[PDB]
Inverse folding.
RNA sequence: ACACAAACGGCGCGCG
């Protein structure tokens, strides 16, 4: 991470879209460093819907400039998350803080 | 505010410190600037250009 | 010839990894002279026990994924590089660690043997996150001094490196921290006799007293060369 | 079109052309170097002098044929390095920054071999080259024939070029850091440790300091 | 070595190189071994040393070749 | 190898002058050159055991800048001038010396009233120049045996306690290739001494002193 | 038979 920051670190990482985001208010139950799956609060569970959201992390893959973009987890099973929370860190990020 | 934080820290409000030559163990003359800085690597490393 | 020979008058294991030691009595300016040299020698010269090998239960490269684990393979290598151990009367050895089910892993989990020593069993190793998940890895240890990059090592070995064997950089030094202070203490019931104190932090793999004595012996080797003119 | 203008043969090919036995590298400063010396990486050096190496190998008789010589060089064997040192023992070399400002922009140097990949330059000379180490690259060429080698050593060699040609004045005036340290050294303090003694000469002065 | 002095003996930069090369090729493949001692130098330097002494010069070289032709 | 380090096969004895021999070492383990150079440097100026000259008892001259007639240089300069003197004293820890000369002439260490149990590096060394034929001066001077060096920070005149017979040391550390790597260092050393002990032999003594300290920690 | 090897011309972005 950067030590002496300016306040843009959270925002840039989130809008960049390289990091994973909690699409719904939910709690975590799985980890494989390749996928993350979330159990969602009833208030956002839809009547004819599973009640769970799963994400697949992008792994080592050449960028347009020949650099890897692999994503990494930053959570644990059973851990709660608000909607919009940072789910998985990407390159040059930690806890959704821009870290060049 | 920075001065107070240094005092709250463990360093003089000036931030400069004495130092010693790693080769000879003798002290350098008067304090010098010692600090922690954020540093970046640019995508231009030598082997990719030589 | 008025020199009084210093001695390692006291030793202190202030912490299980951090230690203090003092030398006395010392002639004028010698404390600085010895202090600088001993600091320099210790950091460079100390012989280390370090790990450089990883054999795993099926992945084929550093960048591979793993079923039901919290982290990627490469991050495992970083943790292993951080891990350190002491070995008794040996030059190299292989260790293995097996776990299954949802749980975090620590150095204690290793298949330890009495002729091997783990400095921090609580040291963190990557976690398991599935009921059917399991890990069974093997690692080799070596004795060396200094540091070596992985690429240079294989090119020196030149024998076939089988798939499933992963390479890490050797960082042998058992210690990396040195502070030493010269002070005046009473010998000959007079002033102008110097007292020296050293302190260091370690990965616990060596006895501090052995470190200074081993280092001093090493310095004597180079010093003796100057008589060879 | 092929003739006229900037893309024409005149500029494209005739008045400037790609040359074999050339290389480009990133620059670095070697304080230990003497003014006449320059440090270059082994990797480039091994490539640059292959024809020379083959001759010495066959002069050594170790290589049965050119292809054998080339084959051995692939090894990068110790003997290759031994021969390379012998070959490079005094051979001058050419270093130029781009774009050149003036004839001082190109000067000759004697090489020393380096394990890394940057090319090392003497600090005093680089100033004349106007080199700034924020990432500047540099190009290297080797003179082949006897005549060129003498030409390079006689004229281009750095020791020859202490004076600017635009003005008969030293271009070698020291750097910012070199000058400041001496400036600090030469300054005086009204009162200081050890002040007021009488010394027979610099010899004891150095010891006392 | 760096000369900055032999040029005084011959008196011209260009002539220094030209004359030196003429001598150099002699010791290179032409025979006529070096006159100055050898210190694992290269012929360019070795010949350069010969002029640096003022030992070799164009006039001597002109004499050397013409007298040698003989039979 | 795990507990073995490279050692130098050293060859250089270049006495550009007998008072200073240029010496060189190679190969050394990476970084040892600075360690060894600094250690020996600190030893040589600070630790050497030697004899030093410090005393003047002289008529009327209370202090170094009080002056007297018959000599063309000031007491201040003379005190400086004699400090350059270097002498070897056998056995005795201190010795007192007397000088007495007259007339227009330069005065040398040879004029010194001496025991014969004492030796000068340069009997030809000059410490006085006399102004007139009637001019004559005489004084008592002291030689003292001691370890190291001190300035004059210690009815009579006194000067620095410069026991060390040496004042010059420059050490250089540059690399040389082994058959397959170039990370190893050379050590190049130059130092200058008055010649009571010629430079080379003193170096072995310098190592000896350090060795005595390390031997306590021997394994 | 003791021997060749993969660029022609544009565009964008950066570099000192
Ligand atoms: Mg630049």
């Amino acid at each position: 991470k950067p030590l002496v920051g300016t306040g843009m670190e959270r925002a840039v990482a989130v809008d960049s879209g390289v990091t994973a985001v909690a699409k719904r208010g939910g709690v975590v139950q799985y980890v494989d460093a390749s996928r993350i799956v979330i159990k969602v609060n009833e208030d956002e569970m839809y009547p004819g819907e599973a009640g769970i959201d799963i994400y697949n992390l992008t792994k080592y893959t050449r960028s347009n400039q020949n650099t890897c973009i692999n994503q990494m987890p930053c959570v644990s099973l059973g851990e709660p998350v608000e909607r919009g929370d940072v789910l998985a860190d990407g390159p040059s990020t930690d806890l959704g803080e821009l870290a060049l | 505010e920075i001065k107070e934080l240094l005092k709250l820290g463990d360093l003089p409000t000036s931030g400069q410190i004495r130092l010693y030559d790693g080769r000879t163990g003798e002290q350098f003359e008067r304090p010098v600037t010692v600090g922690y800085m954020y540093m970046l690597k640019l995508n231009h490393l030598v082997d990719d250009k030589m | 010839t008025e020199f009084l020979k210093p001695r390692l008058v006291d030793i202190e294991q202030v912490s299980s990894t951090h230690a203090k030691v003092t030398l006395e009595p010392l002639e004028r300016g010698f404390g600085h002279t010895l202090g600088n040299a001993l600091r320099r020698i210790l950091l460079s010269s100390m012989p280390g026990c370090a790990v450089t090998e990883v054999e795993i239960d099926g992945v084929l490269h550093e960048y591979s994924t793993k079923e039901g684990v919290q982290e990627d393979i490469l991050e495992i290598l970083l943790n292993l590089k951080g891990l350190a151990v002491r070995v008794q009367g040996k030059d190299e050895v292989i260790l293995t660690l097996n776990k299954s089910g949802i749980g975090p892993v620590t150095a204690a989990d290793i298949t330890h043997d009495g002729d091997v020593e783990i400095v921090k069993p609580q040291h963190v190793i990557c976690h398991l996150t599935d009921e059917n998940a399991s890990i069974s890895m093997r690692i080799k240890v070596q004795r060396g001094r200094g540091y070596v990059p992985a690429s240079t090592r294989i090119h020196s070995e030149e024998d076939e490196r089988p798939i499933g064997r992963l390479l890490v950089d050797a960082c042998y030094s058992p210690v990396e921290r040195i502070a030493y202070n010269v002070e005046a203490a009473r010998v000959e019931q007079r002033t102008d006799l110097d007292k020296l104190v050293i302190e260091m932090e370690t990965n616990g793999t060596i006895d501090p007293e052995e470190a200074i004595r081993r280092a001093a012996t090493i310095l004597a080797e180079q010093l003796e060369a100057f008589v060879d003119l | 079109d092929m003739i006229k203008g900037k893309q024409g043969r005149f500029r494209q090919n005739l008045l400037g052309k790609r040359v074999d036995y050339s290389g480009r590298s990133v620059i670095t400063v070697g304080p230990y170097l003497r003014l006449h010396q320059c440090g270059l990486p082994k990797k480039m050096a091994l490539e640059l002098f292959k024809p020379f190496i083959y001759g010495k190998l066959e002069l050594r008789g170790l290589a049965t044929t050119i292809k054998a010589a080339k084959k051995m060089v692939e090894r990068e064997e110790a003997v290759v390095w031994d021969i390379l040192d012998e070959v490079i023992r005094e051979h001058p070399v050419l270093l130029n920054r781009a774009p050149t400002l003036h004839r001082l922009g190109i000067q000759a140097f004697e090489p020393v071999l380096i394990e890394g990949k940057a090319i090392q330059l003497h600090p005093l000379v680089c100033a004349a080259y106007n080199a700034d180490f924020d990432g500047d690259q540099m190009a290297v060429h080797v003179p082949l024939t006897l005549e060129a080698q003498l030409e390079a050593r006689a004229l281009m060699m750095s020791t020859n070029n202490i004076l600017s040609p635009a003005n008969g004045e030293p271009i070698i005036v020291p750097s910012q850091d070199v000058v400041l340290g001496l400036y600090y050294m030469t300054r005086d303090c009204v009162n200081a440790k050890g002040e007021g003694m009488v010394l027979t000469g610099p010899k004891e002065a150095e010891r006392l300091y | 070595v760096t000369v900055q002095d032999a040029v005084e003996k011959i008196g011209n930069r260009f002539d220094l190189v030209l004359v030196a090369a003429r001598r150099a090729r002699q010791m290179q493949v032409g025979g006529k071994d070096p006159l100055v001692p050898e210190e694992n130098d290269k012929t360019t330097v070795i010949a350069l040393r010969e002029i640096e002494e003022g030992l070799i010069n164009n006039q001597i070289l002109d004499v050397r070749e013409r007298q040698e032709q003989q039979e």
Summary: Residues D 132, 134-136 surround magnesium ion (CB under 6 Å).
